[PDB]
Design a protein around this ligand. Structure first.
Ligand SMILES: Nc1ncnc2c1ncn2[C@@H]1O[C@H](CSCC[C@@H](N)C(=O)O)[C@@H](O)[C@H]1O
Lengths: 6, 250
């Protein structure tokens, strides 16, 4: 969730 | 018998294999996606032990000719762990060093940004996003304030560039974490297999970019989570989203 998603 | 092993990202490993088909010897090379820049030297089973900056001058019938670049810098496989980002935090990546630089972002109040040094075409790898490897659980369970630089690598891993490595003075081995967000980005995050960092992500252009153009990526946060919306994203992002949806030309 709290992390960039390529 | 020279073998070339190409990664989907465009990089490759090249050299003569040993009796057991292993990429082991003192004349093996990792070749970056530009098919020119190389790390040449001692490898064991395809793992870089001592690679020196080189240029792939020419290839004749699959046989490469490399010539070492000036300097004394050496590189080795140095995969990050949960709490060690690099053994040589201030040793830059030579391919990245020729393509991008960090400077004040053109985006108001967005700190530093990542910029191109060169004019390149579409689908060009520009920068590497290395970092410590932690779990989604760790990242998902803590405050957004600690999640400025987390990037999902795969189902089990999140790459992060935590304090104090988010400052170039402390860490410049890779620079992908310096690219700011845009809803009209000129780059994307993509998979990358790096001879020093191992399996990471890179920044790849979506289209041609000019020298001194800021590089931006869509961070890809969830705009409408299943557990009752309001994007699961930092405030600045939610604000920019509203500004984007507005001003958007339909
Ligand atoms: N479009 C945008 N607008 C405002 N702030 C942004 C932004 N994109 C990224 N940021 C910011 O930069 C962050 C992520 S890392 C990007 C690197 C850069 N800000 C630097 O000098 O470290 C953020 O958490 C955030 O503060």
């Amino acid at each position: 969730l709290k992390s960039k998603k390529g | 018998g020279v073998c070339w092993i190409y990664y989907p990202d465009g990089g490759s490993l090249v050299g003569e294999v040993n009796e057991d088909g292993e990429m082991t010897g003192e004349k093996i090379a990792y070749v970056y996606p530009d098919e020119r820049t190389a790390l040449y030297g001692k490898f064991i089973d395809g793992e870089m032990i001592e690679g020196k900056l080189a240029t792939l001058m020419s290839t004749e019938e699959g046989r490469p000719h490399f010539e070492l670049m000036p300097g004394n810098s050496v590189y080795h496989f140095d995969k990050s762990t949960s709490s060690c980002i690099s053994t040589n935090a201030l040793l830059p990546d030579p391919y990245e060093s020729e393509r991008v630089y960090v400077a004040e972002s053109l985006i108001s109040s967005a700190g530093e940004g990542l910029f191109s040094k060169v004019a390149v075409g579409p689908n060009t790898v520009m920068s590497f996003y290395n970092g410590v490897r932690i779990t989604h659980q760790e990242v998902d369970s803590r405050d957004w304030a600690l999640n400025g630089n987390t990037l999902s690598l795969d189902e089990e891993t999140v790459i992060d560039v935590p304090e104090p490595y988010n400052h170039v003075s402390k860490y410049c081995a890779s620079l992908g974490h310096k690219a700011n967000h845009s809803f009209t980005p000129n780059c994307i995050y993509d998979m990358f297999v790096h001879p020093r960092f191992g399996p990471i992500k890179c920044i790849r252009t979506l289209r041609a970019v000019e020298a001194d153009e800021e590089l931006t990526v869509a961070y890809g946060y969830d705009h409408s989570p299943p557990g009752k919306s309001g994007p699961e994203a930092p405030e600045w992002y939610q604000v920019e989203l509203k500004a984007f949806q507005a001003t958007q030309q339909k």
